[PDB]
Write a protein that binds this ligand. Structure first.
Ligand SMILES: C[S@@+](CC[C@H](N)C(=O)[O-])C[C@H]1O[C@@H](n2cnc3c(N)ncnc32)[C@H](O)[C@@H]1O
Ligand SMILES: C[S@@+](CC[C@H](N)C(=O)[O-])C[C@H]1O[C@@H](n2cnc3c(N)ncnc32)[C@H](O)[C@@H]1O
Lengths: 257, 257
């Protein structure tokens, strides 16, 4: 065998997990261990469940809310965490059964409405900025700072921003950042001695999830090795190093307003 | 909704076809319309069949030879081309039933042996140089000019070289160039206004072929749209233009020895 085949040990989901950890780490630095009575998180995809699981140790009650009911499949069936679809959450709110002191909005572009958010009175409000590199259309579609507006000078307000250092990503979306990370890594790996080519093992996940509601297929596909390499040399370690370096190019922080 | 999903009309196979056409055009310019009694082409993947069908108009007999029998699946039922595995071809040689005046070697790295080639006496010999940008391991593994050595100054000898302008590719392989073209295109498409991300729809085709022998799955996978785009705006025309521009970076020519 002169030509070999090497799959990275790092999977697509490992990349998404690492990015999710950086994002929550930014939140943890922002909150500084403050405890809450009731947390509401909007948006399960893609790192809403992780956020809920982590904040649950600092909160008596945690609600994870999504406009799509099928997203419940991503929420395991026991913990301080309660999943609700948006309509269920609105109903309980009207009944005065929820009154969160921490609200986290992860819905991004075309997500939750400022009008709805304005009905609440949290101690702390965090919204994830979906924007990435400068882009006229994306900037126009974004209304992040209209979501923060009702809480300014009334609550502790933070805007979560995630970017790639000296690299281009169009959004701060976990999967988008994952895609760009893996694609970039495949290009750098290609340059390694003896490598013939490197394939980024990505699929169109939002068609699978939001148009077929097939979570298990989604989970199966992201469990694939991030990159498959055709090479004359064992470059596995070097490939893992490139993936790790690209992951660490990702920088997440919370801007306080 | 706000976010759209757009597939390119160009499929993966369309890219490979374009590259195959550029490669053959270089061969056709080299051959200058010379006609032959018997053509032997080594290596069907990925553009051996196309070469065979085109040369069939200029030859009384065309043999397409591969070390792998399952490669026969790439040779359609509606042509004059004759497939032989290497052992069958060798057997015909021993019986004195083959004596090609044109030999085309497309096997690339670790391919056909110079010793075996030296057994023949063609009028014209063409070898595809598998190399791309300089790579110490690939350069060492290549023995293109030891394959030409027995035919120098006795026959018309050409070395087919295929490269990417202002880009790095490690080999001249049709699929390799296809992979690099589509990945590069997806990155450039990503930069367009309103585009959120772009996925290159590539698979690990050599696992499907050499280790599942599933040509139908391969053909099915390459018939997929080259790139899937998540975007706020309809950028289909611009995406096809970018894909076309990247394809046109590929340049093929035959160096006469
Ligand atoms: C586009 S994803 C955002 C991804 C996330 N910001 C990240 O970086 O990984 C939006 C998620 O929030 C949910 N969502 C969208 N609109 C919502 C709304 N109005 N209220 C609650 N959830 C919503 C969607 O179902 C989807 O799961
Ligand atoms: C790596 S591919 C070459 C791809 C081609 N040069 C291109 O650019 O598309 C090699 C092909 O030649 C065949 N092959 C490899 N060794 C061979 C040999 N010794 N004799 C005949 N065919 C061979 C393989 O089955 C495979 O189909």
């Amino acid at each position: 065998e002169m030509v070999k085949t090497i799959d990275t040990k790092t999977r697509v989901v490992d990349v998404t997990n690492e990015i999710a950890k950086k994002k929550y780490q930014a939140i943890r630095d922002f909150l500084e261990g403050e405890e809450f009575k009731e947390v509401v998180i909007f948006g399960v995809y893609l790192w809403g469940n992780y956020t809920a699981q982590m904040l649950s140790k600092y909160a008596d009650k945690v609600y994870l809310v999504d406009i799509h009911e099928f997203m419940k499949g991503f929420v395991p069936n026991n913990n301080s965490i309660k999943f609700l679809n948006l309509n269920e959450f609105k109903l309980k709110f009207i009944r005065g059964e929820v009154n969160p002191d921490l609200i986290v909005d992860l819905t991004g572009l075309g997500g939750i409405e400022p009008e709805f958010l304005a009905k609440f009175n949290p101690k702390v409000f965090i919204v994830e900025d979906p924007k990435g590199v400068f882009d006229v259309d994306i900037y126009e579609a974004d209304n992040t700072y209209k979501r923060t507006a009702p809480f300014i000078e009334k609550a502790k307000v933070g805007v979560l921003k995630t970017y790639r250092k000296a690299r281009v990503s169009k959004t701060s979306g976990t999967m988008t950042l994952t895609i760009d990370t893996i694609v970039d890594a495949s290009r750098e790996i290609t340059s390694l001695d003896g490598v013939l080519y490197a394939i980024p093992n990505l699929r169109y996940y939002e068609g699978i999830l939001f148009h077929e509601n097939d979570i298990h297929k989604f989970l199966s596909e992201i469990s694939q090795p991030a990159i498959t390499i055709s090479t004359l040399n064992d470059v596995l370690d070097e490939a893992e190093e490139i993936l790790s370096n690209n992951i660490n190019l990702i920088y997440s922080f919370v801007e306080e307003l």
